[PDB]
Every structure is written in C-alpha cells, then in structure tokens.
Amino acid sequence: AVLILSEARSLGLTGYDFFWIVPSLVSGNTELIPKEFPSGLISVSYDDWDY
Amino acid sequence: FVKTTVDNSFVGWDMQNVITLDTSFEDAKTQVQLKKIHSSVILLYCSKDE
To answer: Mutate which of B23, B32, B33 to test chain A, going by most A C-beta atoms within 10 A?
Structure first.
C-alpha cells in the first residue's frame, strides 16, 4: 500500500477529486500511520473506541 | 498565427486543450496536462529531442 501510494502520487493520481477506499487490514492498528497516506481516505474497520 | 487563421475562416474548426507544458517531463503536471487530450489529431512544435 505504501509503495503503491508513493508511485501513484508522482503520477498525479492523488488530486483534489480522487477518493480512495481501503479494506480493514491496511489500517492495522490506527496508530502507525505513515507519511504517504493522503488525507481523506475512507477505510471501513472494526470498532475499538466503543464496545 | 494559428489562432488568427482558425478565427477568420469559413469552415469552422473546433480546438480544445491548447497545452504549453514546461515542467520537467515526468513530474505530475505534465502527466495530467497530457491526459486532458481526448480528441484524435495532434499538432506539436518542439526541437527534435523534445
């Protein structure tokens, strides 16, 4: 995922109208986010703040 | 000159996306600017290597 994002930012695929959707297993623990993840990235995941 | 010729013409030509790309040749902006073109005929004005 990190390599794909880095290779896609340089290709212009990451602009003001480009919505990325990502499965639950990429957002591992929501506490080790790298620097290549663009802002506004929807990714459904299981709950840990509640329950 | 091409603008002047196309303007005062009796046939009527359609023209879109007049690109003037000068920023490296593979750095983001050139890619999208080249991707904007979707018609099929191209006029380009360069110097051999470019």
So the answer is: B32
Torsion of CA A39, A44, A46, A48, to 10 degrees: 30
- CA-nearest of B48, B45, B19 to B32 is B19
Q: In the PDB record, what is the listed experimental method?
A: cryo-EM
CB of A8 within 8 A of CB of A14?
Answer: yes
Task: Report which of B5, B23, B25 is spatially closest to residue B15, judged by C-alpha positions.
Answer: B5
CA separation for the pair A11, A4 (Å, rounded): 11
Residue A43 and residue A9 in contact, taking contact as beta carbons nearer than 8 Å: no
* Chain B positions in Cβ-Cβ contact with residue A14 (cut-off 8 Å): none
Is A50 among the annotated ligand-binding positions? Answer: no
Q: How far apart are CA B35 and CA B37, in angstroms?
A: 5
Residue with tokens 């902006």: B29
